[PDB]
Write a protein that binds this ligand. Structure first.
Ligand SMILES: [C-]#N
Ligand SMILES: [C-]#N
Lengths: 124, 124, 124, 124
């Protein structure tokens, strides 16, 4: 995977959350997520995918992953998906936008989904 | 998993795309996706997560998954994440919103990401 | 405005909300919105814009509008923007996606914004 | 309007775009937008709304506005809506997320809408 090495490891977003990921040669992303905010404690499983053969023209690397907010400690009856791109070089970034959907009744379905943006760095 | 049985199987969206998924007792989603539209052909790997112990109050089941649009045939240098909820009963649905991010240059990053909504049914 | 006539009037979404709009020759949208759901009662002012000279190739007509959820009855300390396109012909539609932002503290800013989709018709 | 004074004036986002707005005592936003990127040149009309009586608890002020990307120079057959909140004090900000919809054919409607985020400051 072209950015397998670049992506694999520990990442931190602007909220102080921690994303620990392994990138597989096959396009797999596996790891754990720890949210500094919301109805969350400790680590949650994540899985996702990335483009293991990106464009050679200085474009970033498309990727995404999911966390369901259930672990042994808590269940927030919700899942977040991050969609974004990895940008390599001296100050590597993963720039994402995310959708957080809660399980709701049909009456409340219109308010099921939050949208936001997280920027992940290798430091802080 | 409460909706493991409900979720596992073949789903169809309003665009004529096909989503084939296995739900694991542990919250895993694994399978393949075939898009009726865009820079896509044949099946792509998907992975994701779902709430294996949802609320008992008639709420839906939160879930999400990712496809990176690389397979043996094509590479669209992009990934989609679907975030939504499974709603059980006679006419079972998965109601999603999705983010599609393309790898871009930093100049074009502002236009990296599409947002849309897909509704999945067990028929048609 | 090419679709001035097409757009002007009363529209209904899938939630039973009512959107009453005048399209101006200059691209203006003005009117009122009444939400069937959420922290809302009676009519709220809306303003927005539309493409008064759309493509002639069967493309829809881009448009958007805002409601701030303050009127004489209530203040939900929030605003929704609908972004979408008007599609003309026998069963005219306005197909939208929307962002609802609440005023929050900086601590809660990550959860400030909902995303959804509304489809508006001239009947029901 | 509590933040009428705070909001009215010239704002700059991270892309180098310029947003010139007047906030009305009644919740109105009117002005012009000049995009540093995309199929845009010179100024475009904007209109929108803001919460003229926000919470007193340190919450931001909800607001939104629309630009249709037609002016005397160009027509990009598209509209953007920004949804966000104004945050007052020494380093005032407008933190937004936006939807950009293009007029499309029904075949291409699934790819009609971009999502992004802009942060506006009074300097740079
Ligand atoms: C690409 N439009
Ligand atoms: C507010 N939940």
């Amino acid at each position: 995977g072209r950015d397998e090495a670049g992506i694999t490891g520990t990442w931190y977003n602007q909220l102080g959350s921690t994303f620990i990921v392994t990138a597989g040669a096959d396009g797999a992303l596996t790891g754990t997520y720890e949210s500094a905010v919301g109805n969350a404690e400790s680590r949650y499983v994540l899985t996702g995918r990335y483009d293991s053969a990106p464009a050679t023209d200085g474009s970033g690397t498309a990727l995404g992953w999911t966390v369901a907010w259930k672990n042994n400690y808590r269940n927030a009856h919700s899942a977040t998906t991050w969609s974004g791109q990895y940008v390599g070089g001296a100050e590597a970034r993963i720039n994402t936008q995310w959708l957080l959907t809660s399980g709701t009744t049909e009456a409340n379905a219109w308010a099921s989904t939050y949208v936001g943006h997280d920027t992940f760095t290798k430091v802080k």
